[PDB]
Amino acid sequence: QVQLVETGGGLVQAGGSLRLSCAASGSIFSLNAMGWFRQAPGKEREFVATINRSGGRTYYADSVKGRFTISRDNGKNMVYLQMHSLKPEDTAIYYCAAGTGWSPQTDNEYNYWGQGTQVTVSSHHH
Amino acid sequence: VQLTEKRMDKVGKYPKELRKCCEDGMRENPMRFSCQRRTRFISLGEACKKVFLDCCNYITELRRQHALDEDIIAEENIVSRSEFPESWLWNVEDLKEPPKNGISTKLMNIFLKDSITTWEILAVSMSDKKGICVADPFEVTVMQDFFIDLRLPYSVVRNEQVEIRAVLYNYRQNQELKVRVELLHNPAFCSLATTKRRHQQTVTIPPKSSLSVPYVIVPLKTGLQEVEVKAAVYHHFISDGVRKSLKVVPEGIRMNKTVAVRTLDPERLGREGVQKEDIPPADLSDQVPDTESETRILLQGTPVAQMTEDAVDAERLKHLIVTPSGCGEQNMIGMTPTVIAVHYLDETEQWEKFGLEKRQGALELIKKGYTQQLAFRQPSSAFAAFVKRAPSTWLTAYVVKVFSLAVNLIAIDSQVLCGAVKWLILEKQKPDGVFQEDAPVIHQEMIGGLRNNNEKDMALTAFVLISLQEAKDICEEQVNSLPGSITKAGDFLEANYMNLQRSYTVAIAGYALAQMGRLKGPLLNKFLTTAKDKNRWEDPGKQLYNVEATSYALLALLQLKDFDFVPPVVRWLNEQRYYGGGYGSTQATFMVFQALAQYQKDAPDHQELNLDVSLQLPSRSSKITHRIHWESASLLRSEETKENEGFTVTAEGKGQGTLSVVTMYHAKAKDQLTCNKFDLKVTIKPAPETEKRPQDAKNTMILEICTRYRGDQDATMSILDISMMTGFAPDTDDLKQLANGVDRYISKYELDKAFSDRNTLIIYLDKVSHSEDDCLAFKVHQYFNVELIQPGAVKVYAYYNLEESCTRFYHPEKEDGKLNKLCRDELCRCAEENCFIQKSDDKVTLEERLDKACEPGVDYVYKTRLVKVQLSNDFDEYIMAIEQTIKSGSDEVQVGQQRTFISPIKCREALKLEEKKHYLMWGLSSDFWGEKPNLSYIIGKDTWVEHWPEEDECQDEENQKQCQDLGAFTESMVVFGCPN
Amino acid sequence: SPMYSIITPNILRLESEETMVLEAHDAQGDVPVTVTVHDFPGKKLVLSSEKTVLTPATNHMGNVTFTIPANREFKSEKGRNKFVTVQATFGTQVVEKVVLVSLQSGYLFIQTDKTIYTPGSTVLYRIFTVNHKLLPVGRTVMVNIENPEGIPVKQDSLSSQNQLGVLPLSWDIPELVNMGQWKIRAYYENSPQQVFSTEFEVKEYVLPSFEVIVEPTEKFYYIYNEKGLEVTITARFLYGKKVEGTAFVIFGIQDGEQRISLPESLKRIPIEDGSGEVVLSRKVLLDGVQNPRAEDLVGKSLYVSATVILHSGSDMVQAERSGIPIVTSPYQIHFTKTPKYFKPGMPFDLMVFVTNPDGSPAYRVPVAVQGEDTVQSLTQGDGVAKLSINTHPSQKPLSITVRTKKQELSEAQQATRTMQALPYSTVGNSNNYLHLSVLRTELRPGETLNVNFLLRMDRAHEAKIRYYTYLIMNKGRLLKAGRQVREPGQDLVVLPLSITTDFIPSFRLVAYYTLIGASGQREVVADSVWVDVKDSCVGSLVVKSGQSEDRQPVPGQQMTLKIEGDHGARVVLVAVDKGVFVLNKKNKLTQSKIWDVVEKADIGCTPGSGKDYAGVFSDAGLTFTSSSGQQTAQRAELQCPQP
Ligand SMILES: *[C@@H]1O[C@H](CO)[C@@H](O[C@@H]2O[C@H](CO)[C@@H](O[C@@H]3O[C@H](CO[C@@H]4O[C@H](CO)[C@@H](O)[C@H](O)[C@@H]4O)[C@@H](O)[C@H](O[C@@H]4O[C@H](CO)[C@@H](O)[C@H](O)[C@@H]4O)[C@@H]3O)[C@H](O)[C@H]2NC(C)=O)[C@H](O)[C@H]1NC(C)=O
Ligand SMILES: *[C@@H]1O[C@H](CO)[C@@H](O)[C@H](O)[C@H]1NC(C)=O
């Protein structure tokens, strides 16, 4: 059905911030679970954050419990991932995924995925 | 010792033909009649009777042992499922875009239906170059893993304690779902959820299974209310919800009692000036408290304006008759009235003003009727009243008549009609000229007298002759013996015409003889003499048969072209509308339609419509002047008033019409005071628990109905109209055993739900014997357990004479008091708030009593003394006595007169009254109510009731504080007025 | 010597383009020919002259395609076959032939959305109006819906001229009506004698609490297998929860359309976890007493009636499994696709049709002929395997016996079948036969098929054969016709037959040559062949999902539906439940049903040969007549003689 296009990544300072915009190509209502997933090189496909169909219910992984904030605008068909207080271990390919609504913390109930965007958080010098 | 394999093993040792009788003999008869009493009802099986007795006796003495046990028959050759989801996506689209490698591609976005099922879309292409191509099915497995199902009964009567249940379905295999299910609040019924707090509870559904969450509700207002449950899962993002509509019906039974019917005609009646006509108010001596009433005033510009207008409209044709249609002649509603209506409109050239577009619609209705009627046909074109019964002569001839009259409108197959005429003439007519009937009687004029049955042949032969009089040139090449059959029938009628004693026989025989031109001289005098008052052919004890006889006689008069004896007969036939604007049975409405319609053959100095009917209604502030004219599209006008009053009507001008005054109210559940022509007993007894019940069912009970005719002979056609209690439904297994078995006790059942109050169960009986009681019983299952149940109704009536009836009511009557749904929570105080005022939790001062007593609505303030208490299972009646009128109301009452206050049953425990105790009560002028005995104060949300302790017990601690306040209240309401 | 040959379809269809092929042999000049058809009897003309000339620039092949307008004459209303006389005048020499007529005017196919209904539901039905070439045409058709008493309760009459051969129709079943096998009749207004019918059952409204499926593990029963018939009783609620209860099951034998219920096989098995297995042992099976033997029960069928009762309620649902065969061999050998005549001396090709007990075609089934059982031939997907035998030239009526030699089997479970083939009849005992051979494959339009022409004759008059005359018979009409050149001294002559979408679904090739015979008379040697093309659409259409496998869609979801059809074509759709599409018996509307109907109305009755020299044309569906006195025996049978 719907396909997704992620943008807003790039290279950023060590502790800076950036917002990742996920553009949808269809209808974003009736999509219960909309989730951001990341995959770093040498890592399994891990879970970042999921938002409910109307918001309010938000799930985060412990590694981004208070540093990240996922939002969505159903009117514009956009899902946002604000990344504040970045850490160099967050360097990864961040994907936006359409889901079913069942068990959002796992990645088996997301039948539609996006292209991804590279976020490189460079450490001080080195 | 499974004892089922024994039964079937013994069944397998009888010849394959005549083998069903041992199967039906092995069956547990719910009406537990012995073998020798069941072999009385078996019809045709001579060797079957012995076989039925052999096997019945067998299994019955094998049941005398073994006090888990399986005692059900394993039958064969029956297909199981039907009712598959309705098809959709039925549209014709085409491909017209440039092809890619010769293959065009078109994308069509569709919306799936709300059904959980595996749809398989089928496609077929038609190309005018490459021919046809049938495609493979595209299987679309529509599925949802969390589905919520709300189980609520068909209809709930107000103030009942029902427990609906919300079933949650979990189809996740690996997950055990924790979900928060919540019942939403509706101010129209007391639920555990209020406006102060929600009713949300957390449950856990096991995987691949369901869970039923119960909610007990008490409906407070009649009408369609919203039951809405919301479920939010406690882990995932799946949020489902169900919003169904539950209709709450009033506490009694709906009645459309006809107040009066008056022929509106100023020229032949009303003498000098014009005619004034008083219309009385309704009876309503039993109207259910706090229910509305609607009076519909119907003005028909012509005697047959409503019957036609209803005969044309599809969703209004079945409103002409107040009886079901599930049998050969009854089903003819789908033809007869529409037929004679279309013919009346053709002869009077009225389709131009009425609407040409509707004519074809009427014709399609006739087609549908014809289709339905073809279901009652047997081989050799013989029509029986019910399938699996002997073909009847009367019904066959009647179908011949209606079909031969319908060959002008729709396409009627000549094989069926001609084969039926052949069956009648060849087989059922004896060289005596007499027609034999070898089926059970349908009309009560088909059975005739006993020791001399000469008139029995007379009425049937005259009817069949009337039938053949309209198949003369329609069916003759196939059956060339029509002139001879008419000859012999007319000879038998004209010879034994002076042997007729009943006026019906004289009427129908006179019309049959007039159709041939053989009604003259002594037959003419003898015929016209019997007419009592020279405007009706009647017999005492047969009411609708007099309407039939007057109709046939009017057709005889119009056949002779006599225009003198007619106007009184038209005035009488126009005022026999007793059941709504129409008539009870089918034959009455049909024959009155035909006769009153055929009085307007032409306009030979006949009255043209131009009436000026004014109505002075007491409910309205001004006169109401309706003016219906000829050459108007609607020869009908009607008004509705919500207040029952007796209004005066004044007709004026030229024109003959009808004034139908009908009301609609809800009567109480009291059994029939005087049952006219029927004895009827209804009992309900619970069934054992270990005896298996269906899965969804909670409790099973047995319902037993015993009826008897009080006539000199057996009743000819009877209906058991049983309205189910709320949450109940009949056991179709037993109904099938009684309607289809070899020992037949039911012609057929219906369960014809017309969406009126609770669902009804119509049972058809071929006859009701007067020598005994025709008892029959069957299981009823309660799929939703209800408390404070309002009883159910069972009305028996003869089809062709509705005054032969008896209305009884049934109820379990649980012992000594009221078991309700647990009253501890506010769910109960909510329900008890509705029927009497609420006290501030023993914080009651006389100043508060003065406030609530000095409200502007407070019309009466009494001091009652509880004389008698007669409590029923629907409304408790407290016969009180006024000892001092502290503030008399708008109704004059003397000190010492009794007043019978009515209270809902659900409030009894809330009032906990004791006889011979004093009471302080006050209320509104709206509390007064119209019944007889003229003692009608309804205790409602505005009726203050408080027990007044006697003088001797004011010397106790808990009483004196109240006593002095009540005395100061009395003197402060007598001597000092209200300042508000 | 002049010889004007006329061959045209043996049965002429009305309102259909029938191609007539007339020739001129041994004549080097061009002769003008005008062909006309007359009503028999009388001089009533129903076709114009249809001009043509046979110039040596086209090797004397003629074209006079014509349509026969449908009219009432010569007792088309009294039970006679209203024959017509065709005229073929070559200058002055006239050749005429009385040809049988079949008022058919095309085909009508009926689509019903369901087959089992409820009194009160709606029946959505469509009528498709095509001609004999399965192209949409505008005709007037009467549509009558009949109750089981045979009384039309819904009459309609419409023309599908500008609706592109489709007529959408609807009818609402009343609440009280007949019960049984309701029918839908559909016939052409011009040809009411030809009716098409689709049946459906109205039955009544029943909603069971659970479904019970009862079926055996084997799709057949091998008689000598003493393991018995193992039957599986599964039962689950209509929402996926398995039924817990007990099942009373009984077995019986269905002989023809009657049955013998066996009161000795009644067993009560517990249905636990929606599962239950019960076996009917061969011990109890053989004990049915009429005459006790195991080979008399072959041909009959079994049936399993099961009654499942719920443990937690009084609910009770029964299901019956019928149509299970009692076979002596889990495979069947059919010669119905094999010709019934053979040519002595020249080899005989056998189109042995291998099938399964349920009638389904078999795949990879080694078969062999008795006697020379040292041959290896496997079955293809279509179910046909060719077995050739080099017979000796004799007057012997050839009795062939074919048996399958599929190992991994007891080889008692291998079936054998014996066919009898009658010899050919050469005019003048000339020993002149021609044999057409092809390699059996499941071929598609677009391929080229090499048709192997074989010609065996005496050494005299071998240089007189320079041309084979080949004609293509497709769906009853004459498709293509022409000549295949030949240089004298050749025994095998390959014909490159270019197969297109027109040869669907099956075609018959007729090849003949005429010459002055060695006996002095006119010799016409002929042979035919029935070639079966893969029965697929002339066009193409599929229906698939949208963007990216829309997974298990939820109710109310907007899913994109992709339709793949032909350019310039209306597409009708109807979404029905699987639960009604599965149980409709064989009353489905498939492409295979269409091709089966078209092949059922084929004029030819025999695969690829005839009883004599003229029986080849008659068995191929062609009337052959000449100016020299050679003709076929005229037929008065609109239906082939059933063997
Ligand atoms: C028992 O007796 C009761 C008597 O109440 C029957 O119930 C009634 O059945 C009547 C018909 O048989 C219903 O008549 C209808 O009246 C409607 C009028 O309602 C309002 O009228 C006001 C007037 O200004 C409008 O503003 C409102 O918008 C409503 O229209 C008509 O609308 C309705 O249909 C129309 O009738 C007119 C002419 O009368 C046509 O010109 C128009 O095209 C359309 O046909 C119809 O006339 C009556 O409402 C109904 N009462 C209720 C609430 O049920 C029972 O059916 C009887 N039951 C049995 C079992 O016998
Ligand atoms: C006549 O048309 C048919 C069909 O295309 C073709 O086979 C035949 O060759 C045509 N006739 C001639 C003389 O080419």
Author numbering:
A (entry chain C): 1 to 126
B (entry chain B): 673 to 739, 751 to 1663
C (entry chain A): 23 to 665
Paper text:
The point of convergence is the cleavage of the 186 kDa complement component 3 (C3) generating the C3b fragment (178 kDa) which becomes covalently associated with the activator surface. In contrast, properdin (FP) is a direct positive regulator of the AP and stabilizes the convertase by associating with C3b in the convertase and proconvertase, reviewed.
An FP-convertase model should rationalize why native C3 does not bind FP despite that the binding site is located entirely in the C3b C345c domain, which at first glance has a very similar structure in C3 and C3b. We superimposed this domain from six C3b containing structures and two structures of native C3 including a new structure of C3 bound to the hC3Nb1 nanobody on residues 1,544–1,610. This revealed a striking difference in the α2-helix and the loop connecting it to the α3-helix. According to our convertase-FP structure contacts from this region are likely to be formed with FP TSR5 residues Arg351-Arg359, and if the C3 conformation of this region was adopted these contacts could probably not be formed. The α3 helix as such is also slightly rotated when comparing C3b and C3, resulting in a small difference between the two states in the location of Phe1659 at the heart of the non-polar C3b-FP interaction.
